Amino acid sequence: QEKIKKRIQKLKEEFATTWHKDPEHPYRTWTYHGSYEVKATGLVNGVVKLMSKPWDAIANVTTMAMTDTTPFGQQRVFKEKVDTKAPEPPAGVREVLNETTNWLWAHLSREKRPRLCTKEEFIKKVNAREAVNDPRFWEMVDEERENHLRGECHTCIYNMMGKREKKPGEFGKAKGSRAIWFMWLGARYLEFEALGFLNEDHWLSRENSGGGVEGSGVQKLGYILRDIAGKQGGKMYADDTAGWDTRITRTDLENEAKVLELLDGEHRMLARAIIELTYRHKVVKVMRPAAEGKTVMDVISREDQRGSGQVVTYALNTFTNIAVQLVRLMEAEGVIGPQHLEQLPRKNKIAVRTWLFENGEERVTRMAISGDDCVVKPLDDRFATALHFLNAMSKVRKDIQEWKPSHGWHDWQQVPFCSNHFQEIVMKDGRSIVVPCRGQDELIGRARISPGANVKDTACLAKAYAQMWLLLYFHRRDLRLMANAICSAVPVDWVPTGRTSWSIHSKGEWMTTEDMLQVWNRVWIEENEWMMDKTPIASWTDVPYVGKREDIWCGSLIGTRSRATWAENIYAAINQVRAVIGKENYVDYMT
Ligand SMILES: [Zn+2]
Ligand SMILES: [Zn+2]
Numbered sequence: 001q002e003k004i005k006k007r008i009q010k011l012k013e014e015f016a017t018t019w020h021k022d023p024e025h026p027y028r029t030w031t032y033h034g035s036y037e038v039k040a041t042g043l044v045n046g047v048v049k050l051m052s053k054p055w056d057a058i059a060n061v062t063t064m065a066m067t068d069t070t071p072f073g074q075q076r077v078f079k080e081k082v083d084t085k086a087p088e089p090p091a092g093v094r095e096v097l098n099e100t101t102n103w104l105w106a107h108l109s110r111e112k113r114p115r116l117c118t119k120e121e122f123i124k125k126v127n128a129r130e131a132v133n134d135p136r137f138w139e140m141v142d143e144e145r146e147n148h149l150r151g152e153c154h155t156c157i158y159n160m161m162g163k164r165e166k167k168p169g170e171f172g173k174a175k176g177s178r179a180i181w182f183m184w185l186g187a188r189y190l191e192f193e194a195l196g197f198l199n200e201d202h203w204l205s206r207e208n209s210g211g212g213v214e215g216s217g218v219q220k221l222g223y224i225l226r227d228i229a230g231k232q233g234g235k236m237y238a239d240d241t242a243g244w245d246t247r248i249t250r251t252d253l254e255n256e257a258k259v260l261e262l263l264d265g266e267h268r269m270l271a272r273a274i275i276e277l278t279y280r281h282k283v284v285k286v287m288r289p290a291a292e293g294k295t296v297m298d299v300i301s302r303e304d305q306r307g308s309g310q311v312v313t314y315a316l317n318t319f320t321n322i323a324v325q326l327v328r329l330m331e332a333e334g335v336i337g338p339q340h341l342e343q344l345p346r347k348n349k350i351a352v353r354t355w356l357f358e359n360g361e362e363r364v365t366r367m368a369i370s371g372d373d374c375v376v377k378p379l380d381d382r383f384a385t386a387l388h389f390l391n392a393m394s395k396v397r398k399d400i401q402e403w404k405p406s407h408g409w410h411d412w413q414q415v416p417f418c419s420n421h422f423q424e425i426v427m428k429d430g431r432s433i434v435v436p437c438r439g440q441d442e443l444i445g446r447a448r449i450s451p452g453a454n455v456k457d458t459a460c461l462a463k464a465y466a467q468m469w470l471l472l473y474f475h476r477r478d479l480r481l482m483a484n485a486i487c488s489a490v491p492v493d494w495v496p497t498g499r500t501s502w503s504i505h506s507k508g509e510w511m512t513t514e515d516m517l518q519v520w521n522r523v524w525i526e527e528n529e530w531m532m533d534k535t536p537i538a539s540w541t542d543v544p545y546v547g548k549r550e551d552i553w554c555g556s557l558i559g560t561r562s563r564a565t566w567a568e569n570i571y572a573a574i575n576q577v578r579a580v581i582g583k584e585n586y587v588d589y590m591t
Contacts (some may be wrong), residue, residue: 003276004301006147006154007034007283011299024292026075029085030300040287040295042070045450046580047462051485051573054562055444060171064445069162069180071287071295077163078286081177086247086394092344093392094251096336096352100323101255103356105224107210107364108203108261110318116267122189131185131302141186148190148273149266154247156187156311159285171439173416174399176243181309191311192280195259198315204307204369211322215316218505219472219523222422222434223530224368225375231366234381235408236415242398244317244372249394249480250304253280255323256316279306314483314504317371318335322364324395325376329363330355332386341392368417375417384408418505423574425475427544433524433534435475437546439461440555443469443479446500457497459581462486464496467510471520475546477535477558484540484589485570487516489577491584 012019015036025032055061068077089097123132131137140155147154161180168174197203204212206224213224229236241247257275260268281303288298306316332335335355340348368375376383384406391402396516400406409415413423420436427433447465450458466486469479494512509519520543521536537543545551548558557563566573578586 001281001303003153003281004283007157008151008301010154011157011283011285023288023296025288025298026079027083027298027300028165029083030302033299033301035288035296035298036392038287038295038297040071042295043450045448045462047486047489048444048447048465048578050490050577051462051482051570052448053573054557054560054566055441057562058441059121060167060169060439061448062442064167064442064449065168066165067162068165070398071289072494074160074164074287077165077177077179077391078160079245081243082160082179082307083103084243084246086249088251089251089392089394090342092340092342093389095344095349096327096330096389097251097255097323097393099349099352100326100330101258101320103328103353103360104315104319104323105258105262107360108208109380112201112203112208114259114262114267115195115197115201116270117200119189121196121200122192128185129552137186144186144190145193145270149269149328151273151277153273153277153281155184156190158183158282158284158389160284170421171442173240175240176398177247178243179308181307183309187313189378190270191274194267194274195312198259198312204315204318208370209318209322210361211325211369212318212362213368213370214504215319216418216505217507217523218418218436218503219507219528221368221370221420221505222424222436225415225417225422226424228366228368228375228377229412231377233366233377233379234383235410236375236377237383237406237408238373238417239397239406240374240399240416241321241372241395244321244395245306245313246309247394247396248306248320252320252393253304253306256306256320263394279310280304282307282443307487318369320365321372321374322369324390324393325369325374326356326360326363327365327389327393328383328386329376329378331389332383336389338388339582341388347458364377366372370418373418375415381408410549419503423475423550425544425546427537428542429535429537430533433528433531433544435546436472437475437554438473440476440478442555443473443476444482450498454499456494459490459577460494460497463490463494464498465500465510465531466490467496467512467516468500470516471510471523474520474540474543476554476556477545477548477551478556478563480540480545480571481567485574488587489574490586491581492587493585505585 018037019034021034112164126132144155147576158181161182163177164180165177166175202208202215204214206213213221216224260272263271283301286298287295290296330352335351336348343582366377387403414421420438422434423437424432424434450461452458463486466483473479489521495513517540525534525536551558
């Protein structure tokens with residue numbers, strides 16, 4: 001309307017050559033500005049492939065893909081999951097959220113105090129690299145800061161790279177499609193400068209937030225879910241929101257926007273621009289197929305949507321979701337009902353504020369909130385039908401009838417949270433650990449996919465995944481044999497590279513050359529605050545597995561002929577990989 005002028009013009013200028021206006025574009029909730037012609041931008045780890053021969057016949061592994069940066073996919077994901085708008089909740093609900101979000105910010109700001117982020121802090125985090133080392137780049141930033149301080153935005157533009165899509169089905173919760181947003185690195189230092197304190201100071205850490213899990217490693221999440229289960233109450237609920245990022249309302253954004261009321265002076269002016277000029281009023285570049293197999297880049301805008309692809313995407317999403325789960329708790333406890341949806345009587349409004357103040361600190365500790373992922377153990381199973389405020393906030397549950405009672409789990413070991421479920425297994429020496437578990441077919445498939453184009457880079461990435469399995473998924477019979485086999489087939493002095501997971505709970509303790517038995521012992525015994533007897537483990541043969549029955553359910557191939565042949569001919573596979581990579585220092589870990 002007014003704030004997006006500076007960015008549209010700069011775009012028209014840069015590509016005035018092939019710039020044209022309005023092919024029969026399909027945008028409905030996005031104001032169309034124009035398009036321009038561009039080069040379209042539309043991968044197997046041999047080592048893991050060689051060590052996982054039985055899984056060559058498994059469709060879920062061989063047919064795996066979740067990447068789509070292709071212009072065709074960019075249009076597909078934008079139309080169905082980005083070109084969509086959630087209706088605003090009625091006046092009553094909006095008011096209930098107001099009280100709830102107010103209480104939460106106060107609770108987050110009880111001890112921690114906000115702060116601007118620094119240039120050195122940004123650079124320290126990165127280790128693009130050859131960009132931050134150029135002082136010439138930082139002048140461009142300095143100009144933009146003054147534009148923000150002036151109340152204008154010039155270069156901060158989102159680019160819709162592609163789609164992330166989980167093939168629905170058996171092993172994991174069917175996550176819908178999501179859009180992948182990348183931006184100019186300069187825009188990343190900004191926003192981080194203004195709002196990075198939420199992440200860097202762990203504002204939504206479990207200590208500070210009570211319900212969140214920011215900073216907790218994926219190995220910690222299991223125990224956390226157990227503490228929740230340890231509390232008195234009904235069944236444990238974990239309802240997924242149907243396309244969370246797509247159903248963030250303007251009402252919620254305003255409540256999230258209450259950060260500004262916690263900032264002083266120049267800090268607020270920098271952040272005010274980020275939220276209003278960059279978050280609220282967006283400008284997005286997206287590819288689109290046209291003519292005779294040619295691809296153009298569209299430029300569009302939208303003003304009442306947060307969506308995704310920001311530095312605090314996780315931080316805010318965690319926050320709002322907590323507030324949401326609190327509201328649902330209130331409906332479930334009888335504080336509020338369907339009558340107060342349209343208009344909230346003050347008589348009830350007070351009961352809300354009283355509830356948050358008195359019970360909020362306890363209720364929040366019955367939660368496990370990591371972004372859109374949520375697990376809640378309410379007082380009673382009345383929670384299952386408390387949907388009136390939930391559906392009103394447009395946080396409609398996925399894969400269920402709009403008004404069908406929610407599904408709860410009696411066994412916390414079956415509760416899905418952050419792409420895993422969590423099993424408690426008893427070690428050989430009598431002690432017990434709570435380990436993460438997930439579809440093995442998915443795990444091996446993701447190991448098979450290499451983004452690079454280099455043997456060492458491939459073999460290090462293979463050793464990367466392998467050593468991850470030893471630390472987290474050692475309890476899976478196939479994965480432990482395959483990891484030890486891969487490590488044994490990769491030069492012992494080679495340092496793991498690349499990333500094995502995108503989950504924010506993946507710390508990367510395995511990205512080392514250290515003996516993983518030490519690292520395991522470090523993570524699961526020494527630093528594991530739920531392990532009282534700190535007695536170290538001597539060897540892997542003391543490190544427990546899950547039950548066979550449980551393992552096969554979760555995708556194991558044990559007790560099959562094809563795997564059995566593979567396990568006893570594992571050495572042949574190792575000797576091949578060694579012979580291909582070449583003369584280096586190898587170690588036999590298969591003992
Ligand atoms: Zn800007
Ligand atoms: Zn499992």
